[PDB]
Amino acid sequence: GPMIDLYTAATPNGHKVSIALEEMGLPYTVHALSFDKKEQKAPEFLRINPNGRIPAIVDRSNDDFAVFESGAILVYLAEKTGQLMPTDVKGRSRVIQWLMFQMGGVGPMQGQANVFFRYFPEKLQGAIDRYQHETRRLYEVLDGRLGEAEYLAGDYSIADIATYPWVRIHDWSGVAVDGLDNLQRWIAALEARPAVQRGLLVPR
């Protein structure tokens, strides 16, 4: 079968990896973990990702080598296929920089907006405001960069793939993109890519 096993769920972080696999044309096997049944905390899965979160992959071509953390999976797959990250020092670093910005900024902060605005047992408007405002600030950083280049690292790369599934759900998080015309251009460009469309449907 496929050489990549993908452990995932219908979430922004899972969609990063299914989008990348679809863009790269790599076959994969989907393991859709049920958070309802706490399958992401099963010790059989903890052997693959000790953090007990999705996504994770196992590369069957590499002696069943596990890779956890969406950003690390994106780097691993880009380096395996030679796609979606340049090989030169500056070009690869620009991808890694914007990927790290997503991994330490956009994902964590927008995820906390979702917690306080949608999930938390009571409404704490000061915490909601903190994370919605911070996410907007991060979106403004993105927008400025997207006036310098068509995609975050220049050419389209894994940095865009990491960032887009989060920006796509800004309405759920209560964070606006109005006034960020470069970000909106990039949203439209990403949305029009067939591989993005396919990756957003994994898992069903």
Added chain:
Amino acid sequence: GPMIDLYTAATPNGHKVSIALEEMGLPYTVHALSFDKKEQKAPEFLRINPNGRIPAIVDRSNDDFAVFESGAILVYLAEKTGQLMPTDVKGRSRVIQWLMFQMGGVGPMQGQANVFFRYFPEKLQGAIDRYQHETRRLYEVLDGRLGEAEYLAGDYSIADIATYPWVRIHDWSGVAVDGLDNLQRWIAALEARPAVQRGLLVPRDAIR
């Protein structure tokens, strides 16, 4: 003279990079930014890091190339020097995985514990508990891995360097390490390293 300019402050995230440079033996020029004077938001610095945060470096050996995000700086420098990250596929990836775990988990979550426990004007015990509990859960992940391997990726690497400055301040964040014997072993090993001690002194904490 030094060909790396380091823009930093006395904080866990800045210490990751000074520790790495000290371990690598790569000279650098320190630019200690004053948060009180808002130097991290000055236009000149935003041209280096558009996020307006430290750390950032400028590599004077390749046309003043800027690198922002501590984790990206660690990858950039490890690749340049050939140190603190293997070059084979599996060894490189294990380092990147644990580095990402720090960058997306330990740093963000412990940072939020610090905000709510010790900076935010509103005292929100549910938010404090959320982030102290999550930081502890992340420490338990580290502890389990450190029962299988001496350092997070096997050999000591940039992943340990990224993680240690945060773990070191656990008590300040209100998070205990009791019951995490492997993490405690690793804390003692990191604290003993001369380059860790040197890097923790740079720049001459401002925030956490």
